Protein backbone atom coordinates (compact mmCIF):
# COMPACT_ATOMS: atom_id res chain seq x y z
CA UNK A 1 0.00 0.00 0.00
CA UNK A 2 2.73 2.58 0.94
CA UNK A 3 6.26 3.52 -0.26
CA UNK A 4 9.20 5.97 0.21
CA UNK A 5 11.49 7.31 -2.54
CA UNK A 6 14.56 9.57 -2.92
CA UNK A 7 15.41 11.02 -6.37
CA UNK A 8 18.86 12.48 -7.15
CA UNK A 9 20.26 14.43 -10.12
CA UNK A 10 23.95 15.25 -10.70
CA UNK A 11 24.09 17.46 -13.83
CA UNK A 12 27.45 18.46 -15.45
CA UNK A 13 28.49 22.06 -16.34
CA UNK A 14 30.61 23.09 -19.47
CA UNK A 15 34.02 23.74 -17.81
CA UNK A 16 36.03 22.42 -14.81
CA UNK A 17 33.09 23.38 -12.53
CA UNK A 18 30.57 23.27 -11.00
CA UNK A 19 28.05 20.34 -11.20
CA UNK A 20 24.62 20.78 -9.60
CA UNK A 21 23.16 18.25 -7.12
CA UNK A 22 19.36 18.12 -6.47
CA UNK A 23 17.84 15.62 -4.03
CA UNK A 24 14.08 15.11 -3.57
CA UNK A 25 12.20 12.82 -1.14
CA UNK A 26 8.65 11.45 -1.62
CA UNK A 27 6.08 9.36 0.38
CA UNK A 28 3.81 7.97 -2.43
CA UNK A 29 3.75 10.92 -4.91
CA UNK A 30 3.86 13.56 -2.09
CA UNK A 31 7.14 15.60 -2.20
CA UNK A 32 8.40 16.11 1.41
CA UNK A 33 12.11 17.19 1.23
CA UNK A 34 14.26 19.16 -1.28
CA UNK A 35 17.99 19.98 -1.49
CA UNK A 36 19.54 22.05 -4.34
CA UNK A 37 23.38 22.51 -4.49
CA UNK A 38 23.16 26.02 -6.12
CA UNK A 39 23.13 28.62 -3.20
CA UNK A 40 25.67 30.33 -0.85
CA UNK A 41 24.59 27.99 2.01
CA UNK A 42 22.43 25.15 0.55
CA UNK A 43 20.07 23.56 3.09
CA UNK A 44 17.51 20.72 2.91
CA UNK A 45 14.02 22.31 2.78
CA UNK A 46 10.62 20.95 3.96
CA UNK A 47 8.01 20.48 1.21
CA UNK A 48 5.07 18.72 3.00
CA UNK A 49 3.43 20.13 6.20
CA UNK A 50 3.93 16.93 8.26
CA UNK A 51 7.80 17.00 8.03
CA UNK A 52 8.01 20.49 9.72
CA UNK A 53 7.85 18.97 13.29
CA UNK A 54 11.38 17.38 12.88
CA UNK A 55 14.38 18.66 14.90
CA UNK A 56 17.67 20.40 13.92
CA UNK A 57 19.73 17.12 13.99
CA UNK A 58 17.38 15.61 11.33
CA UNK A 59 17.81 18.70 9.06
CA UNK A 60 21.62 18.51 9.51
CA UNK A 61 21.92 14.70 8.98
CA UNK A 62 20.16 15.29 5.59
CA UNK A 63 22.19 18.44 4.67
CA UNK A 64 25.49 16.62 5.37
CA UNK A 65 24.51 13.62 3.20
CA UNK A 66 23.35 15.87 0.38
CA UNK A 67 26.46 18.19 0.61
CA UNK A 68 28.73 15.07 0.62
CA UNK A 69 26.74 13.79 -2.40
CA UNK A 70 27.31 17.22 -4.13
CA UNK A 71 31.05 16.14 -3.87
CA UNK A 72 30.74 12.26 -4.31
CA UNK A 73 28.66 12.78 -7.51
CA UNK A 74 31.21 15.17 -9.18
CA UNK A 75 33.89 12.37 -8.97
CA UNK A 76 31.34 9.81 -10.24
CA UNK A 77 30.44 12.06 -13.30
CA UNK A 78 34.22 12.43 -14.08
CA UNK A 79 34.77 8.64 -13.73
CA UNK A 80 31.78 8.23 -16.13
CA UNK A 81 32.96 10.77 -18.80
CA UNK A 82 36.21 8.83 -18.37
CA UNK A 83 34.76 5.39 -19.21
CA UNK A 84 32.72 7.01 -22.09
CA UNK A 85 35.53 9.30 -23.52
CA UNK A 86 33.40 12.46 -23.15
CA UNK A 87 34.82 16.02 -23.08
CA UNK A 88 34.31 18.55 -20.21
CA UNK A 89 32.48 20.78 -22.81
CA UNK A 90 29.20 18.79 -22.54
CA UNK A 91 26.34 18.47 -20.01
CA UNK A 92 26.06 14.94 -18.63
CA UNK A 93 23.64 13.63 -16.03
CA UNK A 94 23.52 10.87 -13.35
CA UNK A 95 19.98 10.08 -12.12
CA UNK A 96 19.24 7.83 -9.14
CA UNK A 97 16.06 6.61 -7.37
CA UNK A 98 16.09 4.37 -4.24
CA UNK A 99 13.51 3.43 -1.60
CA UNK A 100 11.19 0.96 0.12
CA UNK A 101 7.69 -0.47 -0.41
CA UNK A 102 5.61 -1.96 2.39
CA UNK A 103 2.28 -3.82 2.53
CA UNK A 104 -0.85 -3.06 4.65
CA UNK A 105 0.65 -5.56 7.18
CA UNK A 106 3.77 -3.51 8.01
CA UNK A 107 6.56 -5.58 6.40
CA UNK A 108 9.02 -4.55 3.61
CA UNK A 109 7.60 -5.86 0.29
CA UNK A 110 10.71 -4.91 -1.77
CA UNK A 111 13.69 -2.51 -1.71
CA UNK A 112 14.88 -0.26 -4.58
CA UNK A 113 18.19 1.34 -5.70
CA UNK A 114 18.30 2.29 -9.42
CA UNK A 115 20.67 4.42 -11.45
CA UNK A 116 20.93 5.90 -14.98
CA UNK A 117 23.64 7.80 -16.86
CA UNK A 118 22.82 10.32 -19.66
CA UNK A 119 19.08 9.43 -19.25
CA UNK A 120 19.26 5.63 -19.69
CA UNK A 121 19.58 2.63 -17.25
CA UNK A 122 23.09 2.12 -15.86
CA UNK A 123 23.08 -0.07 -12.64
CA UNK A 124 20.34 -1.54 -10.37
CA UNK A 125 19.98 -3.57 -7.14
CA UNK A 126 18.09 -6.87 -7.52
CA UNK A 127 15.02 -8.32 -5.65
CA UNK A 128 17.26 -10.37 -3.27
CA UNK A 129 19.14 -7.07 -2.34
CA UNK A 130 22.39 -9.14 -2.62
CA UNK A 131 23.37 -8.74 -6.34
CA UNK A 132 23.58 -6.06 -9.09
CA UNK A 133 22.31 -5.66 -12.72
CA UNK A 134 24.73 -4.00 -15.21
CA UNK A 135 23.78 -2.46 -18.67
CA UNK A 136 27.14 -2.16 -20.54
CA UNK A 137 30.88 -2.93 -19.91
CA UNK A 138 31.15 0.49 -18.08
CA UNK A 139 28.42 -0.55 -15.60
CA UNK A 140 30.37 -3.78 -14.78
CA UNK A 141 33.28 -1.42 -13.84
CA UNK A 142 30.96 0.34 -11.28
CA UNK A 143 29.66 -3.08 -10.07
CA UNK A 144 33.13 -4.45 -9.23
CA UNK A 145 33.90 -1.24 -7.26
CA UNK A 146 30.54 -1.87 -5.44
CA UNK A 147 30.97 -5.60 -4.69
CA UNK A 148 34.39 -4.66 -3.10
CA UNK A 149 32.92 -1.73 -1.09
CA UNK A 150 30.09 -4.04 0.14
CA UNK A 151 27.54 -1.46 -1.34
CA UNK A 152 24.52 -3.86 -1.56
CA UNK A 153 24.82 -4.90 2.14
CA UNK A 154 24.72 -1.24 3.22
CA UNK A 155 21.65 -0.56 0.92
CA UNK A 156 19.86 -3.74 2.21
CA UNK A 157 20.54 -2.83 5.89
CA UNK A 158 19.15 0.69 5.21
CA UNK A 159 16.06 -0.50 3.18
CA UNK A 160 15.20 -3.12 5.85
CA UNK A 161 16.00 -0.75 8.74
CA UNK A 162 16.16 3.10 8.60
CA UNK A 163 13.89 3.31 5.47
CA UNK A 164 11.11 1.14 7.02
CA UNK A 165 11.35 2.90 10.50
CA UNK A 166 11.18 6.39 8.94
CA UNK A 167 8.37 5.55 6.44
CA UNK A 168 6.09 4.11 9.23
CA UNK A 169 6.97 7.31 11.27
CA UNK A 170 6.20 9.64 8.28
CA UNK A 171 2.92 7.74 7.66
CA UNK A 172 2.00 8.17 11.36
CA UNK A 173 2.78 11.95 11.63
CA UNK A 174 0.97 12.69 8.34
CA UNK A 175 -1.87 10.09 8.65
CA UNK A 176 -4.60 12.77 7.98
CA UNK A 177 -3.21 13.19 4.40
CA UNK A 178 -1.07 10.07 3.64
CA UNK A 179 -3.38 7.35 5.06
CA UNK A 180 -6.57 8.92 3.63
CA UNK A 181 -8.09 8.12 0.18
CA UNK A 182 -10.03 10.84 -1.72
CA UNK A 183 -12.62 9.33 -4.17
CA UNK A 184 -12.92 10.60 -7.80
CA UNK A 185 -15.65 13.08 -8.73
CA UNK A 186 -16.92 11.63 -12.05
CA UNK A 187 -18.75 13.04 -15.15
CA UNK A 188 -19.61 12.04 -18.78
CA UNK A 189 -17.81 11.57 -24.55
CA UNK A 190 -16.12 12.23 -22.02
CA UNK A 191 -15.18 9.71 -19.26
CA UNK A 192 -13.77 12.16 -16.62
CA UNK A 193 -12.39 11.35 -13.13
CA UNK A 194 -11.44 14.51 -11.13
CA UNK A 195 -10.02 15.18 -7.63
CA UNK A 196 -8.89 11.73 -6.43
CA UNK A 197 -5.99 10.47 -4.28
CA UNK A 198 -3.83 8.35 -4.75
CA UNK A 199 -3.15 8.59 -8.56
CA UNK A 200 -3.70 4.81 -9.24
CA UNK A 201 -7.06 4.70 -11.06
CA UNK A 202 -8.54 2.54 -13.82
CA UNK A 203 -10.91 4.06 -16.42
CA UNK A 204 -12.30 1.38 -18.77
CA UNK A 205 -9.92 -2.00 -25.73
CA UNK A 206 -8.31 0.75 -27.95
CA UNK A 207 -9.61 3.96 -26.20
CA UNK A 208 -8.37 7.58 -25.54
CA UNK A 209 -6.13 6.89 -22.46
CA UNK A 210 -4.76 10.29 -21.14
CA UNK A 211 -1.96 10.29 -18.47
CA UNK A 212 -2.75 10.90 -14.73
CA UNK A 213 -2.19 14.63 -14.18
CA UNK A 214 -1.76 16.56 -10.84
CA UNK A 215 -4.31 19.28 -10.00
CA UNK A 216 -2.32 21.51 -7.62
CA UNK A 217 -4.33 20.59 -4.49
CA UNK A 218 -2.32 17.30 -4.09
CA UNK A 219 -5.39 15.72 -5.93
CA UNK A 220 -5.40 13.94 -9.34
CA UNK A 221 -7.39 13.94 -12.60
CA UNK A 222 -7.83 11.60 -15.65
CA UNK A 223 -9.93 10.91 -18.81
CA UNK A 224 -16.94 2.97 -19.02
CA UNK A 225 -16.10 2.08 -15.36
CA UNK A 226 -14.16 4.01 -12.63
CA UNK A 227 -12.28 1.70 -10.20
CA UNK A 228 -10.44 3.50 -7.37
CA UNK A 229 -9.34 2.75 -3.76
CA UNK A 230 -11.52 5.58 -2.33
CA UNK A 231 -14.68 3.92 -3.70
CA UNK A 232 -16.32 1.07 -1.72
CA UNK A 233 -17.87 -0.06 -5.07
CA UNK A 234 -16.54 0.46 -8.67
CA UNK A 235 -18.55 3.21 -10.45
CA UNK A 236 -20.72 2.44 -13.51
CA UNK A 237 -20.88 5.42 -15.94
CA UNK A 238 -23.04 6.12 -19.07
CA UNK A 239 -24.62 9.44 -20.30
CA UNK A 240 -27.19 10.25 -21.65
CA UNK B 1 15.24 9.56 5.87
CA UNK B 2 17.99 9.26 3.20
CA UNK B 3 20.91 6.72 3.08
CA UNK B 4 24.44 7.89 3.64
CA UNK B 5 27.14 7.10 1.13
CA UNK B 6 30.10 5.40 2.79
CA UNK B 7 33.68 5.65 1.41
CA UNK B 8 34.47 4.07 -2.06
CA UNK B 9 30.71 4.16 -3.00
CA UNK B 10 31.38 6.23 -6.26
CA UNK B 11 30.47 5.29 -9.84
Amino acid at each position, epitope marked *: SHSMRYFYTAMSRPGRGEPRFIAVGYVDDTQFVRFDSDAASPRTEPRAPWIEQEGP*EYWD*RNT*Q*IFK*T*NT*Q*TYR*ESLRNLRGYYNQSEAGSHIIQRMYGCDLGPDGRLLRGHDQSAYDGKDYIALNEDLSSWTAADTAAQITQRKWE*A*A*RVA*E*QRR*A*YLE*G*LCVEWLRRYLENGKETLQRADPPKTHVLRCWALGFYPAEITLTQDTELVETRPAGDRTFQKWCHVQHEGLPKPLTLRWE | *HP*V*G*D*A*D*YFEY
Partner: T-cell receptor
Amino acid sequence: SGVTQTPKHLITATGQRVTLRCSPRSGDLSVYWYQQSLDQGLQFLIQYYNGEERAKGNILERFSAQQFPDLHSELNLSSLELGDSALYFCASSARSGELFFGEGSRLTVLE
Amino acid sequence: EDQVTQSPEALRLQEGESSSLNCSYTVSGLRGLFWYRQDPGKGPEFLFTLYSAGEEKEKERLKATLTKKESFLHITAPKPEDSATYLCAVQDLGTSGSRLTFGEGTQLTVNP
Protein backbone atom coordinates in the same frame (compact mmCIF):
# COMPACT_ATOMS: atom_id res chain seq x y z
CA SER C 1 48.45 -2.55 9.76
CA GLY C 2 50.49 -0.38 7.28
CA VAL C 3 49.48 3.13 8.41
CA THR C 4 52.56 5.21 9.23
CA GLN C 5 52.40 8.18 11.65
CA THR C 6 55.27 10.63 12.53
CA PRO C 7 56.59 11.94 14.94
CA LYS C 8 55.77 9.05 17.33
CA HIS C 9 56.63 11.48 20.19
CA LEU C 10 56.51 15.24 20.57
CA ILE C 11 57.29 17.38 23.61
CA THR C 12 56.38 21.08 23.30
CA ALA C 13 55.71 24.16 25.44
CA THR C 14 52.33 25.93 25.74
CA GLY C 15 51.64 28.44 22.90
CA GLN C 16 53.68 26.46 20.35
CA ARG C 17 52.56 24.82 17.04
CA VAL C 18 53.11 21.19 15.93
CA THR C 19 52.51 19.30 12.75
CA LEU C 20 51.52 15.64 12.84
CA ARG C 21 52.08 13.55 9.72
CA CYS C 22 50.24 10.55 8.40
CA SER C 23 50.61 8.03 5.54
CA PRO C 24 47.47 5.99 4.79
CA ARG C 25 47.65 2.19 4.21
CA SER C 26 48.93 1.47 0.65
CA GLY C 27 45.94 1.75 -1.71
CA ASP C 28 43.61 3.54 0.76
CA LEU C 29 42.32 6.99 -0.29
CA SER C 30 40.87 8.24 3.03
CA VAL C 31 42.45 9.76 6.14
CA TYR C 32 40.65 9.93 9.55
CA TRP C 33 41.96 11.79 12.63
CA TYR C 34 41.17 10.73 16.27
CA GLN C 35 42.34 12.09 19.55
CA GLN C 36 42.62 9.73 22.57
CA SER C 37 43.09 11.78 25.77
CA LEU C 38 44.21 10.12 29.08
CA ASP C 39 41.46 7.89 30.54
CA GLN C 40 39.10 8.92 27.70
CA GLY C 41 37.90 7.26 24.48
CA LEU C 42 38.83 7.81 20.80
CA GLN C 43 37.19 11.06 19.67
CA PHE C 44 36.69 11.80 15.91
CA LEU C 45 38.23 15.00 14.58
CA ILE C 46 38.18 15.10 10.78
CA GLN C 47 38.15 12.98 7.61
CA TYR C 48 39.74 13.61 4.22
CA TYR C 49 39.09 11.67 1.02
CA ASN C 50 41.25 11.93 -2.09
CA GLY C 51 42.63 15.37 -1.10
CA GLU C 52 39.25 16.65 0.02
CA GLU C 53 37.52 17.33 3.35
CA ARG C 54 34.58 15.06 4.18
CA ALA C 55 33.09 14.35 7.64
CA LYS C 56 34.29 16.74 10.33
CA GLY C 57 34.00 15.88 14.02
CA ASN C 58 34.94 17.86 17.13
CA ILE C 59 38.01 19.51 15.46
CA LEU C 60 38.90 22.92 17.13
CA GLU C 61 39.34 26.22 15.19
CA ARG C 62 42.95 26.25 16.64
CA PHE C 63 43.44 22.97 14.68
CA SER C 64 43.58 22.43 10.91
CA ALA C 65 44.40 19.52 8.60
CA GLN C 66 44.88 18.70 4.91
CA GLN C 67 45.34 15.66 2.69
CA PHE C 68 47.94 16.14 -0.10
CA PRO C 69 47.55 14.83 -3.75
CA ASP C 70 50.12 12.12 -2.89
CA LEU C 71 47.41 11.07 -0.26
CA HIS C 72 49.39 11.83 2.91
CA SER C 73 47.82 13.94 5.70
CA GLU C 74 49.05 16.77 7.97
CA LEU C 75 47.29 17.72 11.18
CA ASN C 76 48.34 21.16 12.62
CA LEU C 77 47.67 22.07 16.29
CA SER C 78 48.40 25.70 17.21
CA SER C 79 48.29 27.89 20.39
CA LEU C 80 48.80 24.60 22.30
CA GLU C 81 47.23 24.21 25.78
CA LEU C 82 48.10 21.63 28.48
CA GLY C 83 44.78 19.86 27.72
CA ASP C 84 46.01 19.16 24.13
CA SER C 85 48.31 16.42 25.53
CA ALA C 86 46.95 13.21 23.94
CA LEU C 87 47.50 10.31 21.61
CA TYR C 88 46.55 11.46 18.09
CA PHE C 89 45.73 8.58 15.79
CA CYS C 90 45.27 8.51 12.12
CA ALA C 91 43.31 5.79 10.34
CA SER C 92 42.62 4.89 6.71
CA SER C 93 39.48 3.16 5.53
CA ALA C 94 39.33 -0.03 3.45
CA ARG C 95 36.60 -0.70 0.83
CA SER C 96 34.92 -3.35 3.05
CA GLY C 97 34.45 -0.63 5.76
CA GLU C 98 37.11 -1.15 8.52
CA LEU C 99 39.57 1.58 9.56
CA PHE C 100 43.24 0.66 10.01
CA PHE C 101 44.99 2.57 12.72
CA GLY C 102 48.49 3.98 12.75
CA GLU C 103 50.75 3.57 15.80
CA GLY C 104 49.82 7.09 17.03
CA SER C 105 51.49 10.39 17.93
CA ARG C 106 51.97 11.05 21.61
CA LEU C 107 51.92 14.79 22.26
CA THR C 108 53.07 16.15 25.62
CA VAL C 109 52.50 19.90 26.17
CA LEU C 110 54.38 21.44 29.14
CA GLU C 111 54.34 25.04 30.52
CA GLU D 1 22.34 10.24 18.35
CA ASP D 2 25.53 8.11 17.78
CA GLN D 3 26.66 6.61 21.10
CA VAL D 4 28.49 3.45 22.19
CA THR D 5 28.52 2.18 25.82
CA GLN D 6 30.87 -0.62 26.86
CA SER D 7 30.60 -2.50 30.13
CA PRO D 8 32.28 -3.15 32.44
CA GLU D 9 35.06 -0.43 32.19
CA ALA D 10 37.57 -2.84 33.87
CA LEU D 11 37.28 -6.62 33.97
CA ARG D 12 39.46 -8.75 36.22
CA LEU D 13 39.75 -12.45 35.33
CA GLN D 14 41.62 -15.50 36.43
CA GLU D 15 43.40 -17.51 33.73
CA GLY D 16 40.99 -20.00 32.08
CA GLU D 17 37.90 -18.17 33.54
CA SER D 18 35.56 -17.19 30.67
CA SER D 19 33.65 -13.91 30.48
CA SER D 20 31.55 -11.61 28.27
CA LEU D 21 32.28 -8.01 27.36
CA ASN D 22 29.24 -5.89 26.58
CA CYS D 23 28.81 -3.07 24.02
CA SER D 24 25.45 -1.22 23.69
CA TYR D 25 24.95 1.19 20.84
CA THR D 26 22.49 3.56 19.16
CA VAL D 27 22.62 4.65 15.50
CA SER D 28 20.15 6.02 12.89
CA GLY D 29 21.03 2.77 11.12
CA LEU D 30 23.83 0.19 11.39
CA ARG D 31 26.40 -0.35 8.57
CA GLY D 32 28.68 -2.43 10.83
CA LEU D 33 29.89 -3.03 14.39
CA PHE D 34 33.66 -3.22 14.97
CA TRP D 35 35.82 -4.94 17.60
CA TYR D 36 39.37 -3.72 18.15
CA ARG D 37 42.04 -4.68 20.59
CA GLN D 38 44.38 -2.03 21.97
CA ASP D 39 47.61 -2.70 23.88
CA PRO D 40 48.75 0.16 26.26
CA GLY D 41 49.98 3.21 24.26
CA LYS D 42 49.59 1.35 20.88
CA GLY D 43 47.27 1.78 17.88
CA PRO D 44 43.88 -0.06 18.02
CA GLU D 45 44.14 -3.46 16.19
CA PHE D 46 41.20 -4.80 14.14
CA LEU D 47 39.64 -8.13 15.28
CA PHE D 48 36.32 -8.41 13.36
CA THR D 49 33.27 -6.80 11.78
CA LEU D 50 29.60 -7.81 12.30
CA TYR D 51 27.35 -6.47 9.57
CA SER D 52 23.90 -7.76 10.68
CA ALA D 53 22.13 -9.23 13.76
CA GLY D 54 22.53 -13.01 14.12
CA GLU D 55 26.03 -12.79 12.54
CA GLU D 56 28.95 -14.40 14.40
CA LYS D 57 32.72 -14.04 14.04
CA GLU D 58 35.25 -16.14 15.96
CA LYS D 59 39.03 -15.69 16.05
CA GLU D 60 40.77 -18.20 18.39
CA ARG D 61 39.42 -17.66 21.99
CA LEU D 62 37.26 -14.63 20.88
CA LYS D 63 33.61 -14.89 19.72
CA ALA D 64 31.55 -11.85 18.74
CA THR D 65 27.72 -11.72 18.62
CA LEU D 66 25.30 -9.06 17.35
CA THR D 67 21.73 -7.96 18.30
CA LYS D 68 19.71 -4.81 17.33
CA LYS D 69 20.82 -3.09 20.65
CA GLU D 70 24.06 -4.83 21.78
CA SER D 71 27.17 -6.80 20.76
CA PHE D 72 29.03 -9.27 22.96
CA LEU D 73 32.64 -10.32 22.88
CA HIS D 74 32.83 -13.76 24.48
CA ILE D 75 36.28 -14.69 25.81
CA THR D 76 36.67 -18.44 26.40
CA ALA D 77 39.47 -19.73 28.72
CA PRO D 78 41.52 -16.44 28.67
CA LYS D 79 45.30 -16.31 29.02
CA PRO D 80 47.44 -13.39 30.45
CA GLU D 81 48.44 -12.57 26.80
CA ASP D 82 44.76 -11.72 26.08
CA SER D 83 45.07 -8.72 28.50
CA ALA D 84 44.32 -5.48 26.69
CA THR D 85 41.50 -2.96 26.42
CA TYR D 86 38.81 -4.11 23.99
CA LEU D 87 37.18 -1.49 21.86
CA CYS D 88 33.86 -1.37 20.21
CA ALA D 89 32.96 0.94 17.33
CA VAL D 90 29.86 1.56 15.32
CA GLN D 91 29.24 2.70 11.72
CA ASP D 92 26.05 4.69 10.84
CA LEU D 93 24.32 4.33 7.44
CA GLY D 94 22.28 7.46 8.31
CA THR D 95 25.53 9.54 7.77
CA SER D 96 28.32 9.93 5.12
CA GLY D 97 31.60 8.03 5.16
CA SER D 98 33.21 5.22 7.12
CA ARG D 99 33.80 7.09 10.42
CA LEU D 100 33.60 5.14 13.67
CA THR D 101 32.05 6.19 16.98
CA PHE D 102 34.04 4.41 19.69
CA GLY D 103 33.08 3.07 23.04
CA GLU D 104 35.36 3.92 25.95
CA GLY D 105 36.68 0.35 26.12
CA THR D 106 36.66 -2.62 28.52
CA GLN D 107 40.07 -2.95 30.18
CA LEU D 108 40.82 -6.68 30.61
CA THR D 109 43.49 -8.05 33.00
CA VAL D 110 43.98 -11.82 33.14
CA ASN D 111 45.64 -12.80 36.43
CA PRO D 112 47.91 -15.83 35.61
